[PDB]
Amino acid sequence: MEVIELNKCTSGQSFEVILKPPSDPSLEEIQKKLEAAEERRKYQEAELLKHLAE
Amino acid sequence: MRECISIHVGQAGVQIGNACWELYCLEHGIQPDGQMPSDKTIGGGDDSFNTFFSETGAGKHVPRAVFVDLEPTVIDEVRTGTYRQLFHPEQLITGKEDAANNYARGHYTIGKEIIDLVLDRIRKLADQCTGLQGFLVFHSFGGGTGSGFTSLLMERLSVDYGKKSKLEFSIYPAPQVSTAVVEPYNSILTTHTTLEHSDCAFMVDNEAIYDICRRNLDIERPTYTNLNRLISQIVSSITASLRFDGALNVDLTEFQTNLVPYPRIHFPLATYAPVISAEKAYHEQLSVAEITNACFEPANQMVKCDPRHGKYMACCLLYRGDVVPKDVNAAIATIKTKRSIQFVDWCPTGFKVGINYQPPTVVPGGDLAKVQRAVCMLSNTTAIAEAWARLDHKFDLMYAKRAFVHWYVGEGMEEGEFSEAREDMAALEKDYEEVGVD
Amino acid sequence: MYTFVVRDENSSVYAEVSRLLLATGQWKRLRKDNPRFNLMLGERNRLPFGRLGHEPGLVQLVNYYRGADKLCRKASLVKLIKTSPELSESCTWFPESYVIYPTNLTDEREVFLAAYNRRREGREGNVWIAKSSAGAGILISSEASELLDFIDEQGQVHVIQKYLEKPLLLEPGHRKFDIRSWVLVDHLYNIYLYREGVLRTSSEPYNSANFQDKTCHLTNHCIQKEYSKNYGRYEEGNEMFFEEFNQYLMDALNTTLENSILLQIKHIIRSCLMCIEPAISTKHLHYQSFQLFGFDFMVDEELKVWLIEVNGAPACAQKLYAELCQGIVDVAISSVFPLAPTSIFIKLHHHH
Amino acid sequence: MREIVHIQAGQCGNQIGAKFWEVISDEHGIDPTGSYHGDSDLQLERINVYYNEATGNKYVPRAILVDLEPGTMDSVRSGPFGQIFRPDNFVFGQSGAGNNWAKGHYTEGAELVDSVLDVVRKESESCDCLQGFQLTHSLGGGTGSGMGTLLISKIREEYPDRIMNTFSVMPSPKVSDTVVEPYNATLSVHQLVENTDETYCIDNEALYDICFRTLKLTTPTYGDLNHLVSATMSGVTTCLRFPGQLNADLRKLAVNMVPFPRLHFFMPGFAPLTSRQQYRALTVPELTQQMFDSKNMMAACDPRHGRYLTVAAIFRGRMSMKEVDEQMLNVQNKNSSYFVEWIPNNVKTAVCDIPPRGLKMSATFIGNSTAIQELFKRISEQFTAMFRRKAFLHWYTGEGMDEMEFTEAESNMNDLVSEYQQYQD
Numbered sequence A: 001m002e003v004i005e006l007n008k009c010t011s012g013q014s015f016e017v018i019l020k021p022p023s024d025p026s027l028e029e030i031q032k033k034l035e036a037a038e039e040r041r042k043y044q045e046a047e048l049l050k051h052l053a054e
Numbered sequence B: 001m002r003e004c005i006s007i008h009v010g011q012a013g014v015q016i017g018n019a020c021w022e023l024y025c026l027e028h029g030i031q032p033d034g035q036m037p038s039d040k041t042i043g044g045g046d047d048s049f050n051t052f053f054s055e056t057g058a059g060k061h062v063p064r065a066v067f068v069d070l071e072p073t074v075i076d077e078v079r080t081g082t083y084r085q086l087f088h089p090e091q092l093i094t095g096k097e098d099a100a101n102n103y104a105r106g107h108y109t110i111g112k113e114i115i116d117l118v119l120d121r122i123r124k125l126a127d128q129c130t131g132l133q134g135f136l137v138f139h140s141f142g143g144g145t146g147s148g149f150t151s152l153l154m155e156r157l158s159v160d161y162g163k164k165s166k167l168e169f170s171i172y173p174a175p176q177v178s179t180a181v182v183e184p185y186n187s188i189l190t191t192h193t194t195l196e197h198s199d200c201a202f203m204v205d206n207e208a209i210y211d212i213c214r215r216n217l218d219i220e221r222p223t224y225t226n227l228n229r230l231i232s233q234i235v236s237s238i239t240a241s242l243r244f245d246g247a248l249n250v251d252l253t254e255f256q257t258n259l260v261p262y263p264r265i266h267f268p269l270a271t272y273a274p275v276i277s278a279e280k281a282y283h284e285q286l287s288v289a290e291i292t293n294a295c296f297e298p299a300n301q302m303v304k305c306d307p308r309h310g311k312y313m314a315c316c317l318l319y320r321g322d323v324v325p326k327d328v329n330a331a332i333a334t335i336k337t338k339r340s341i342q343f344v345d346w347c348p349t350g351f352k353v354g355i356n357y358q359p360p361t362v363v364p365g366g367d368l369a370k371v372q373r374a375v376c377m378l379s380n381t382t383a384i385a386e387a388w389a390r391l392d393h394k395f396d397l398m399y400a401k402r403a404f405v406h407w408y409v410g411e412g413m414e415e416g417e418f419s420e421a422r423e424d425m426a427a428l429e430k431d432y433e434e435v436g437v438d
Numbered sequence C: 001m002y003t004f005v006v007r008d009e010n011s012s013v014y015a016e017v018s019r020l021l022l023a024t025g026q027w028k029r030l031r032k033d034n035p036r037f038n039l040m041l042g043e044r045n046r047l048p049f050g051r052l053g054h055e056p057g058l059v060q061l062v063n064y065y066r067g068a069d070k071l072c073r074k075a076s077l078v079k080l081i082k083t084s085p086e087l088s089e090s091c092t093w094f095p096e097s098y099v100i101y102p103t104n105l106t107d108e109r110e111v112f113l114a115a116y117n118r119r120r121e122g123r124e125g126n127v128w129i130a131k132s133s134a135g136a137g138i139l140i141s142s143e144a145s146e147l148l149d150f151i152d153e154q155g156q157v158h159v160i161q162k163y164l165e166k167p168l169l170l171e172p173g174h175r176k177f178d179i180r181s182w183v184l185v186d187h188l189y190n191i192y193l194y195r196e197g198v199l200r201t202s203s204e205p206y207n208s209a210n211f212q213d214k215t216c217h218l219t220n221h222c223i224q225k226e227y228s229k230n231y232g233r234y235e236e237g238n239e240m241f242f243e244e245f246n247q248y249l250m251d252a253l254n255t256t257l258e259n260s261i262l263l264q265i266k267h268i269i270r271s272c273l274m275c276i277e278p279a280i281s282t283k284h285l286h287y288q289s290f291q292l293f294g295f296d297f298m299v300d301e302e303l304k305v306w307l308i309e310v311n312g313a314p315a316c317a318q319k320l321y322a323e324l325c326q327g328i329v330d331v332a333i334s335s336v337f338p339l340a341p342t343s344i345f346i347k348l349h350h351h352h
Numbered sequence D: 001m002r003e004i005v006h007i008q009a010g011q012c013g014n015q016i017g018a019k020f021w022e023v024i025s026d027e028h029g030i031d032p033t034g035s036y037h038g039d040s041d042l043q044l045e046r047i048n049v050y051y052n053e054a055t056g057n058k059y060v061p062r063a064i065l066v067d068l069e070p071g072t073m074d075s076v077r078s079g080p081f082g083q084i085f086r087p088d089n090f091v092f093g094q095s096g097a098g099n100n101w102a103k104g105h106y107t108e109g110a111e112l113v114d115s116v117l118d119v120v121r122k123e124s125e126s127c128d129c130l131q132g133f134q135l136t137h138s139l140g141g142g143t144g145s146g147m148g149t150l151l152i153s154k155i156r157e158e159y160p161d162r163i164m165n166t167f168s169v170m171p172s173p174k175v176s177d178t179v180v181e182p183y184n185a186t187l188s189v190h191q192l193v194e195n196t197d198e199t200y201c202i203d204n205e206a207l208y209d210i211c212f213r214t215l216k217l218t219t220p221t222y223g224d225l226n227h228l229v230s231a232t233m234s235g236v237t238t239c240l241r242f243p244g245q246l247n248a249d250l251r252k253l254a255v256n257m258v259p260f261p262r263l264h265f266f267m268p269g270f271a272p273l274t275s276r277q278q279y280r281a282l283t284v285p286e287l288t289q290q291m292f293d294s295k296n297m298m299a300a301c302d303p304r305h306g307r308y309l310t311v312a313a314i315f316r317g318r319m320s321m322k323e324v325d326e327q328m329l330n331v332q333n334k335n336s337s338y339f340v341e342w343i344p345n346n347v348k349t350a351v352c353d354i355p356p357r358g359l360k361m362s363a364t365f366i367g368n369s370t371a372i373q374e375l376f377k378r379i380s381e382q383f384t385a386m387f388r389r390k391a392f393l394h395w396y397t398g399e400g401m402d403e404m405e406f407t408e409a410e411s412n413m414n415d416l417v418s419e420y421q422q423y424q425d
């Protein structure tokens, strides 16, 4: 039951009590993922329009 | 002094953000018009409260915050609300149609078209900072914007601000206050993509906040206002160290150093006491031992789970009010001899304690009563993995039938991203089990 | 209309409870994966406690206490007794035991040999028994070399405890036996002891000069019915109930079952369950637990009672299924989900 | 500003559409001349969803009236709220459609469809942010059925990313105008399967049985049936017309109600349904029991014959939201066998403070139930009884259609039935 690193100031204080010791994707890759999804949306809408054209 | 920028995404993030900045102002003595009589340095200064507030030459203290929502109705409340004067228009970003509770719609379809604008508005706030620490991101799991756009924003923040820390305050989906059936999908999609970009995340289960409001506050049917004022009290307790003089959790980095020894396991359980009804005749003020002992009751945890059947990796005790170190140690000793507290063998068995002498501030006319002392415990327990289990189970129930998957694929997302995100969660649950169980 | 699910088809006990529940006409069984349930008769292993108590407007109850395995595991029970101050290492009602991990994997090998070497030098009885939870696999020997070598040939944790060389023998027959007590703990952590126990007796004369033939040394109902040639001779199914046993104690030893044995059994039950109450209690939890336990005791010729083990998923004597299972519905289920005596249990009061 | 564009086509479509605008106009305080005379700000909060604001503070419904004969729309214009509609939004021909799907879809309808789309485009161009469209029509006639589904196909072509919503009256031999109604309905259902996101299935037999047995109306009329549709349309659109959080717009409703794209046909329900004991107060338990009772549903399908994929309930009036949750959870927790267990929490509940005219409180039911296959099985059986003899086909082949197109609609609807069957198990 030890207390360490006691720090005190006008607005409070803090300390540590020890009970027992122990025993990314680049900006380029993000645009590609965003554009790949936009492309799949365009492809799906194109097939919808193609279906409606028939 | 090092600045912190708060980012509020989606309805949950915006509305919770509104409640916090209202509280922040009452705590720092800032008026709705931004004036701060106690700030003797007019138009500048590097005090602790400046980490969250900039200052204009006219003496206005402006939050370092950005609000983002793909639909204008929630953010218009901020534009015409009590604290409309705090913010300027550049800080509030709103689209015209939301993500329809569709992660893929917020991340891809709509996110791609607004991401650069939000980054520009954030860059403006960063340019006022002489030493930016990082970001605090408020959002929900279940919303299409809070889930789908947030993960996009976090990816770009890591690219634009590589060396900056990022903390999360995330709203875990609860059916009692939810009306979107696909929220398990969104929660798991956004956790998968955000996991490597968040240094520390404080999950709040709406179920827990809901029951605390009905049980302790005697609210039969709590509203978002009720839920948000309670949430902002907890948020305030966590961010106080950044806004006040002190030596514990004085910058965002210390949050990871003190609470997250293993990076993926960065979801500390929050526990808060006491929560007393303002409508009460008059309550017996609890001692340091009683509120400390309350930190180990499942009833006041921000996520219902049983820490008795996990292992602790870290534990912070954040006190506010009339608390002296002698009483904390005495209460702590008493709790060890009675409570089940098992630490992982590769971590010390101890507690970091921070005390702020100013007691919790309560919103006038709110639901919470003024108390002489309060505490918020932040503990990294493997027991919070119960939350992932619940969520991953619901995910599996719908995904087995591919129910609702067409809504996501129709927005340009690939079905394989579902299983990819699920396998990441499966590994996350396995990490917890390796650290907690024998 | 209360709802319940069945996730353990092999439980003879809760197969009856489920049968009784439906007979009331006020309980409805759902598919085992339906989450909208009031009561879960859960599986034995890996029961998902973490998914309980998150259904808005459903008081959920389960028939297993999370964390009770610490009491119902061979090695766990030993560790619990030696490390818990409420039980202490000097616990007078539990045989000297040690946890031994096979050398192909803390471990109490040297601590056991020390106590073993002490007995060997002091001319005292030095007969130990080796067993584990992964058994149907038991060895009884007086040489520490045989016990340790037997565990190394296995691959799971084992326990070595003192073998009771002076057991109380029933007459006629000169035969060993053990006592099974059924204990039910409800959601409020009331400890109820079923008034009806059973003595699982050995139909073979006890022979202290031959631990190789384990038929007269192990009182397991399955062993007596497979390897014993006098099964069912003295009593039906090698099961003597309390009424007969009590009459025996009076005719032979001039005492009663309550005074000579039951007081110790009740004391041991309390001590074990109260020890782990803070760790497993569901008093302030979002869901509720109850559990039926099967305590196994030994009685020596000094009429001292020793604890053998605790079973978390016990079966019941064929004659007592109806009464006990009905009792489980009355005190454990209907107490939380009431319907529209002379209790068969004995409440062991205690300080929570 | 999430605008919805309304379209009503044919006799049934315009008569039900007219009553619909009559009901909600009263709820929002709009008088027959478009002037607001309400006393609550909740009435105008979401008024622009269905109404355009003109000069002098006038509110003009965002509705387009379509028909191939003038008759019905003349009655609307001379009806109660007839003057409230934009005169330019009346698009009509003179030939008629003779209850013939081919005339509405391929010949007579094709000649008028472009002018209708010119009005739709006009209304959409003035929308700040158009949600989507809602169409009121029957499937047993010629205009609403044949030309209605033609308009949907051409609207989806020009607004492919907007939600398409319909209220579709399904024919019944008990309330039948002609014997060809199963032909026209089978042809329309395939169009709806493909080009609508949400379809409220309204069976004229259910409306009749409710009027006869429950409401005790000796001789039901079309007007009596349209009263039920009015109240029901007002109930299912409350979420869109007043401040709320759940199913607040069309796309969010679809995302919570349609787990599979083709299975988007809903069973609506309403409560109370009282006969003239009409002044008695109705408790929340009663509201919930009736709302889920089959007799209160307008699809003419027994819910206990299938399973609910998703459910959306709306409670209107000043009532205990706590007590609403309790009774809803009671219905699910007492009949969880009729809800699929692979969609957790698929029953959502929304409340609203403004009740319908003349009622302290009401409840509207929107169920996506696999039992709806019974409705499509009835139509399919009636279709086949005639198609196997090619009876009455000459009305259609005379308009350029081939038998192959009938065989395909037949197979398309049997597919739909089989799709509902695989999820019912």
Ligand SMILES: Nc1nc2c(ncn2[C@@H]2O[C@H](COP(=O)(O)OP(=O)(O)OP(=O)(O)O)[C@@H](O)[C@H]2O)c(=O)[nH]1
Pocket (backbone or CB within 6 Å): B009, B010, B011, B012, B013, B015, B016, B069, B070, B098, B099, B100, B101, B102, B106, B140, B141, B142, B143, B144, B145, B146, B147, B171, B172, B173, B174, B177, B178, B179, B180, B183, B206, B224, B227, B228, B231
């Ligand atoms: N605690 C709390 N939770 C909220 C609040 N608002 C919404 N939620 C929760 O957030 C989830 C829904 O996500 P939202 O934030 O509303 O959706 P969104 O981020 O705006 O994204 P969209 O789909 O575009 O609307 C549900 O689980 C709600 O219970 C709030 O103000 N406070």
Ligand SMILES: Nc1ncnc2c1ncn2[C@@H]1O[C@H](COP(=O)(O)OP(=O)(O)CP(=O)(O)O)[C@@H](O)[C@H]1O
Pocket (backbone or CB within 6 Å): C095, C129, C131, C135, C136, C161, C162, C163, C164, C165, C176, C177, C178, C217, C218, C219, C220, C296, C298, C308, C309, C311
């Ligand atoms: N220390 C000891 N001294 C004497 N006999 C012992 C003993 N430990 C075990 N036994 C004998 O072994 C039998 C049961 O052993 P144990 O209970 O460990 O195995 P088990 O768990 O498979 C049977 P059950 O679970 O049904 O009680 C008892 O009948 C008892 O007679």
Ligand SMILES: Nc1nc2c(ncn2[C@@H]2O[C@H](COP(=O)(O)OP(=O)(O)O)[C@@H](O)[C@H]2O)c(=O)[nH]1
Pocket (backbone or CB within 6 Å): D009, D010, D011, D012, D013, D015, D016, D097, D098, D099, D100, D138, D139, D140, D141, D142, D143, D144, D145, D169, D170, D171, D172, D175, D176, D177, D181, D204, D207, D222, D223, D225, D226, D229
């Ligand atoms: N509920 C209701 N159904 C109607 C009404 N008028 C016609 N119908 C039904 O609609 C079908 C006839 O279609 P109708 O609208 O008259 O043909 P259309 O004008 O060419 O579209 C039949 O099944 C009728 O039962 C009405 O006012 N109310």
Ligand SMILES: [Ca+2]
Pocket (backbone or CB within 6 Å): B039, B040, B041, B042, B043, B044, B045, B046, B055
């Ligand atoms: Ca200053």
Ligand SMILES: [Ca+2]
Pocket (backbone or CB within 6 Å): A024, B158, B162, B196, B197
């Ligand atoms: Ca990073």
Ligand SMILES: [Ca+2]
Pocket (backbone or CB within 6 Å): D095, D111
């Ligand atoms: Ca012509």
Ligand SMILES: [Mg+2]
Pocket (backbone or CB within 6 Å): B010, B011, B071, B098, B099, B143, B145
């Ligand atoms: Mg939103």
Ligand SMILES: [Mg+2]
Pocket (backbone or CB within 6 Å): C309, C311
């Ligand atoms: Mg055993």
Ligand SMILES: [Mg+2]
Pocket (backbone or CB within 6 Å): D011, D012, D141, D177
């Ligand atoms: Mg007609």
